[PDB]
Amino acid sequence: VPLPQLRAYTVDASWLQPMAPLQIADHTWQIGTEDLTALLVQTPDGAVLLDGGMPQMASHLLDNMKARGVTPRDLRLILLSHAHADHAGPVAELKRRTGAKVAANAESAVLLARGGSDDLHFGDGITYPPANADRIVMDGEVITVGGIVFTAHFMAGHTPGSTAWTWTDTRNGKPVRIAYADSLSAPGYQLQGNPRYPHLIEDYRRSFATVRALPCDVLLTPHPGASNWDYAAGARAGAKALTCKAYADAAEQKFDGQLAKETAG
Amino acid sequence: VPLPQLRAYTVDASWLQPMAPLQIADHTWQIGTEDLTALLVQTPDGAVLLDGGMPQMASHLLDNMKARGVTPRDLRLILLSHAHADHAGPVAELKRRTGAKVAANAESAVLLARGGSDDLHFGDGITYPPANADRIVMDGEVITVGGIVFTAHFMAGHTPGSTAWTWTDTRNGKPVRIAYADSLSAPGYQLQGNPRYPHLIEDYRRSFATVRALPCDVLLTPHPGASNWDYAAGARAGAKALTCKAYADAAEQKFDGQLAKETAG
Amino acid sequence: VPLPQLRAYTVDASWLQPMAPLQIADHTWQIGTEDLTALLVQTPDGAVLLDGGMPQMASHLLDNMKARGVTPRDLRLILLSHAHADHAGPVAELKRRTGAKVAANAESAVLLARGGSDDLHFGDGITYPPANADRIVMDGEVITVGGIVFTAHFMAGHTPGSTAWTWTDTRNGKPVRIAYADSLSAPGYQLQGNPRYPHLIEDYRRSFATVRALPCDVLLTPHPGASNWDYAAGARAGAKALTCKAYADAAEQKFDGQLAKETAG
Amino acid sequence: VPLPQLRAYTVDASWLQPMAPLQIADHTWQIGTEDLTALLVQTPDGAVLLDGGMPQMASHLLDNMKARGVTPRDLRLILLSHAHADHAGPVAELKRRTGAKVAANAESAVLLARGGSDDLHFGDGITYPPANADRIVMDGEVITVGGIVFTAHFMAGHTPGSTAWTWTDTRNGKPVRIAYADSLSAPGYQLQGNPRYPHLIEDYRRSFATVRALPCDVLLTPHPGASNWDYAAGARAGAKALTCKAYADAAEQKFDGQLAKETAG
Ligand SMILES: C[C@@H]1[C@H]([C@H](C(=O)O)[C@@H](C)O)N=C(C(=O)O)[C@H]1S[C@@H]1CN[C@H](CNS(N)(=O)=O)C1
Ligand SMILES: C[C@@H]1[C@H]([C@H](C(=O)O)[C@@H](C)O)N=C(C(=O)O)[C@H]1S[C@@H]1CN[C@H](CNS(N)(=O)=O)C1
Ligand SMILES: C[C@@H]1[C@H]([C@H](C(=O)O)[C@@H](C)O)N=C(C(=O)O)[C@H]1S[C@@H]1CN[C@H](CNS(N)(=O)=O)C1
Ligand SMILES: C[C@@H]1[C@H]([C@H](C(=O)O)[C@@H](C)O)N=C(C(=O)O)[C@H]1S[C@@H]1CN[C@H](CNS(N)(=O)=O)C1
Ligand SMILES: [Cl-]
Ligand SMILES: [Cl-]
Ligand SMILES: [Cl-]
Ligand SMILES: [Cl-]
Ligand SMILES: [Zn+2]
Ligand SMILES: [Zn+2]
Ligand SMILES: [Zn+2]
Ligand SMILES: [Zn+2]
Ligand SMILES: [Zn+2]
Ligand SMILES: [Zn+2]
Ligand SMILES: [Zn+2]
Ligand SMILES: [Zn+2]
């Protein structure tokens, strides 16, 4: 009886289904797949990418950038929700193929630099090519690209370094406060008395309150389903989107249910 | 007119004045200099070092370890208060010369890995040889060596990764709850509206409350003067030591004064 | 049509088939699998591991170490042939679970730290958890553990950082010069005019000459088949082993054939 | 008697004396100080910087770049001769303040990432802010920016990762093959039987032959004096410059003399 083969990180096909760029606001586009968010924000001073999805999405992202008039040298900055393989997967390759630099908090930078290995909950089960951050950000710090101001809001829980990114774009000339809020799930996590994350519950509870209070005319999430987006629905892709308040409340109710089930288990 | 020469990080002589090991508790010793703490905790399962002081202290620390019966292979773990040159200075060299592995939180690990460069407040003015952490710890996580349990208590402010380490040793057979609380100073820092540390004030205030509540029969600090230790006073070195409550209260009063002076400046 | 799923690095079952420790010399043991070498050298001053095989082999290696009387704290040093997933796979996890430090040359250290990603020939197709080296070695440098002297002999080609490690053990009291020579294969490589490795051919040719001249009473290789070892053959496992001269000559003949086939292709 | 203060890395004033850009060829400029080379190559596709000199030179380099019409975003690539503090000093800060990415060989990348600490010959005596390489290059590999092709020629000795960079620019319309050859000095080095660099002598001898054979209409060196440049001499700054052949021969004669003196010492 040999040791088991390594198991590839396989996902639902919709997570890997390419889509053409979908406009969210005047200068903000969804350029990932049907079920994984990768946001391109285009400024006169270069482009920002928030998340890249899975490791195998790099070429697709570059194709969609080209379709939008963003060449590899024009990509200046990569920001991340959190450093798991299904959101930061292609960052190392993107850095090699573009001018982009990565800004992230210390927790996300440490996890990215180990390619998602030694995860607090997944171990080495879900890894990806490691990448280095070029700039470390603190909670509430802003990064400004072409007069678009991105604010980091730490919302630890799903990962220690989970971050919501907020900025203001326009839509029909009017300002739109966009909130890219990270995942608030705890998939298979041990929540209570976890020796690798002793204050997990307290961090999640603080993160629900953080998300509830974000400036949030439009909420987007790394898994669009979490905020009720349907990237395949065209002109109605965002019609059913949740508010940040509703997203936080739904995540807290689910979390409270998981806590109760863990106590019973 | 040439550019200025690089300026060495020079310190008061007492900070560099070697001392013989000073016993703090049954298995805990001060082995640094007169004015910089470096704590050696000896267990049947190897030795732990908390801080090393300045970069040039490595050989002295190794001498004091040998005097205590700790060879290079017996040093198993290095913990840090914070990753500035006067506390983590010799860690890289210690790792090369001993069996020791470094455990630190993500913020301290990132700063250590850049040798203290790009400091939020000091820039590149105070650097030291970079070192890599071998284990990343979360707030409240414990590390157990030979039945001595070290608990990390994050107290961000002086640096983002500032940590208090607590453990229980014995003294005349009775348990002694030791608290190695990090610095609570803000030397020359811009406190209000600091773009590199937007929530600095909130973090300091939370850290005062954290220090005030630590299990703390005996408080030690990286600069012994901060907790009223006098490592040169022999059998009375710890006689005047502050409680954790008094240390936090003194640090908060000083901080409030600095805030008021900054507003006036 | 979605993007392809990630493909796991799957291997022949014999590569993953655990075996009990097989004694090579008085203090040198094969403790990996039937078809992947992982050498444990036991000294009074701690144990050295040369290679670990595939990522999923860590627990098996630790079991075999325990069977040999080597606890996790007794493992002092990990050396590598080259930093591909089937030889350095479990190094990150071994470092987390033992006292071991990694010594490697700069090329191997860079590849290990990126977990085998951005490989000159494999791209990101064959990755593993990244690890950091604790000591960088130069060509011909020696590392001495308990009076066993390990000499590094660089033999670039299969990877830039490919290394042969030599040491002298005993067998029936007599000295035995052991040569752990790295792979000399070029599996699917573009050999001529490779922009990522312009001097590939020259390096391979120099490496054949290096291997031919190693001190080599007993040759071992990361894939035992390359040196005609059969780890499942018990008391005759090493009976058919090649000399270093024969191994180099066979590798050069195969390489010359591949060159000719590449020219024709 | 306290431990000694840290000693700053101080240098001759001419090494820190700013100069205005000095044109070497149509698109190649010396933009460092009077006695430290920092070469700016301007292409329609961005600028390349080869070396930056001392750590405190970053702002001066950026000023000279601006004077040349190169903004921070236009700097695309930093190449290095070798990763000592007087040549790679300001690279970390340049990466933070510009769009530049660093390409270097593995040896130079490892030394840069430790900020010059644990030097084979200097120990920790000469350190600088650590930086990460974005691309690793192999011997003979080319990097092309705006149709300027830079070729790496490894010339190990002064450091393991010492590199000569060659490219072709124009001067009065005619092609000029420029050779930026690294230092061939061994200042205070133990040459024979050095355990940290066993093949030092062989590497230096191979490097003399490499430099002698470089394409070399114009030779430049990190210390301009080594190639008989006088950056303060205006229109005659390069008039007395050595050929690559003469530079190698002078370095070999000096090296042979040092070998003989070491034997006598
Ligand atoms: C297990 C999911 C996956 C993992 C993760 O990011 O933790 C990844 C390692 O596989 N991404 C998820 C995340 O929350 O970031 C978790 S939760 C899962 C993702 N979407 C599934 C269906 N719900 S939804 N809201 O998108 O319609 C639930
Ligand atoms: C400027 C001091 C120094 C610096 C630091 O750690 O920030 C170091 C970069 O120089 N270490 C300090 C610390 O708090 O950790 C600061 S505060 C300074 C240290 N001890 C001085 C005298 N007070 S005491 N309490 O020790 O008697 C004040
Ligand atoms: C493609 C093989 C594998 C790869 C490698 O190390 O390059 C790994 C990424 O899959 N390990 C090999 C090595 O040489 O190190 C190559 S060669 C292959 C290994 N053993 C196979 C059968 N020959 S043998 N000599 O062992 O009987 C050939
Ligand atoms: C000791 C010098 C210095 C050191 C170095 O790069 O090794 C640095 C750590 O201080 N830079 C040098 C180099 O070669 O790269 C060495 S040699 C020294 C530099 N220029 C001095 C005068 N000779 S010259 N040829 O420039 O007129 C000799
Ligand atoms: Cl481009
Ligand atoms: Cl020892
Ligand atoms: Cl153990
Ligand atoms: Cl700019
Ligand atoms: Zn996730
Ligand atoms: Zn996810
Ligand atoms: Zn400090
Ligand atoms: Zn201090
Ligand atoms: Zn291989
Ligand atoms: Zn292999
Ligand atoms: Zn040098
Ligand atoms: Zn120099």
Author numbering:
A (entry chain A), B (entry chain A), C (entry chain A), D (entry chain A): 3 to 267
Quote the authors verbatim.
L1 is a dizinc subclass B3 metallo-β-lactamase (MBL) that hydrolyzes most β-lactam antibiotics and is a key resistance determinant in the Gram-negative pathogen Stenotrophomonas maltophilia, an important cause of nosocomial infections in immunocompromised patients.
All three products are apparently bound (at least predominantly) as their Δ1-imine tautomers, with C-2 sp3 hybridized and in the (S)-configuration. All of the respective C-2 substituents (R2-groups in Figs. The tebipenem- and doripenem-derived products bind almost identically, with the C-6 carboxylate (formed on opening of the β-lactam ring) bridging the Zn ions, apparently replacing the catalytic water/hydroxide. The C-6 α-hydroxyethyl substituent is therefore rotated away from the Zn ions and is positioned to hydrogen bond with Tyr33. The pyrroline C-3 carboxylate interacts with Zn2 and with the side chain oxygen atoms of Ser221 and Ser225; the pyrroline N further interacts with Zn2. Their binding mode is determined by the presence of a 1β-methyl substituent: the Zn-bridging hydroxide either interacts with the C-6 hydroxyethyl group (1β-hydrogen-containing carbapenems) or is displaced by the C-6 carboxylate (1β-methyl-containing carbapenems). Boronates bind to NDM-1 similar to the products of 1β-methyl-carbapenems to L1 (binding mode 1), including interactions with Zn2 and displacement of the Zn-bridging hydroxide by the boronate oxygen, together with a concomitant increase in the Zn – Zn distance. The complexed products derived from tebipenem (after a 16 h soak), panipenem (8 h), doripenem (16 h), mecillinam (16 h), cefoxitin (23 h), and cefmetazole (22 h) could all be confidently modeled into Fo-Fc electron density.
